[PDB]
Amino acid sequence: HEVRPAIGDLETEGAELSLVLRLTAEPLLAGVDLEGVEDTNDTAGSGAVDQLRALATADLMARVDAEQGRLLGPVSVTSGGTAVPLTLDRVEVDDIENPELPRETRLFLSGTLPAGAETLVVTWPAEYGTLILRQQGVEAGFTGYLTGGPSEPITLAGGDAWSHPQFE
Ligand SMILES: [Cu+2]
Ligand SMILES: [Zn+2]
Ligand SMILES: [Zn+2]
Ligand SMILES: [Zn+2]
């Protein structure tokens, strides 16, 4: 199965953080090192991915809800060096019966930023492959190509994050 970048949509509405991950769950659950992987068929866990592909959409979801600790452990948001713990609120899985096609899984993550937050850093592990982190709800917002370790700092919208320059 061709490996595509995960896509992450990050939005803040004051202190409320949403991160929505568009991803392929099957490699992440099988434990496959996705770093420099173009196709899961060229990895040792190919059969493990393909067994996971065979499950119904409801089974895949409950397995994602059941293993969130392992899956989300190395995914972190910090803001001013304070950890911003993420909750898994919701899980979608596309229903594609053709087993030779990958299906998208979406994770809906939320947290609360500290009072007065101005920047956050997202950390994604190299083992999970590329993440294209897009900041939503802002003109000329942050884009990042996360291949392992911390993002560059993401500048936040909203009243708390504003700074008045010393002169106009
Ligand atoms: Cu395959
Ligand atoms: Zn590695
Ligand atoms: Zn939906
Ligand atoms: Zn909004």
Numbering used by the authors: 1 to 168
Article, verbatim:
We report the method of signal strapping, where sequences of N-terminal signal peptides artificially appended with a histidine residue at their C-terminus are used to bootstrap a proteomic search. These searches return sequences of proteins with an N-terminal histidine capable of coordinating a metal ion.
The Ang-1 domain of the HupE/UreJ-2 protein from R. bacterium (hereafter RbAng-1a), excluding its transmembrane (TM) region, was cloned for recombinant expression in E. coli. Based on these results, RbAng-1a is designated a Cu-metalloprotein, though Ni²⁺ binding is also significant. Dissociation constants (Kd) determined by TSA were 73.6 ± 2.3 nM for Cu²⁺ and 220 ± 10 nM for Ni²⁺, suggesting physiological relevance for both ions. The copper-binding site of RbAng-1a lies on a flat surface, where Cu⁺ is coordinated by the N-terminal His1 and the O atom of Asn41 in a T-shaped geometry. The RbAng-1a Cu-ligand bond lengths range from 2.1 to 2.7 Å, and the copper ion is three-coordinate. The resulting spin-Hamiltonian parameters of g3 = 2.28 and A3 = 525 MHz and superhyperfine couplings from two Cu-N interactions AN = 35, 42 MHz are consistent with Cu2+-RbAng-1a binding Cu2+ in a T-shaped coordination from the protein-based ligands (N2O coordinating atoms), augmented by a coordinating ligand, likely an exogenous water molecule.
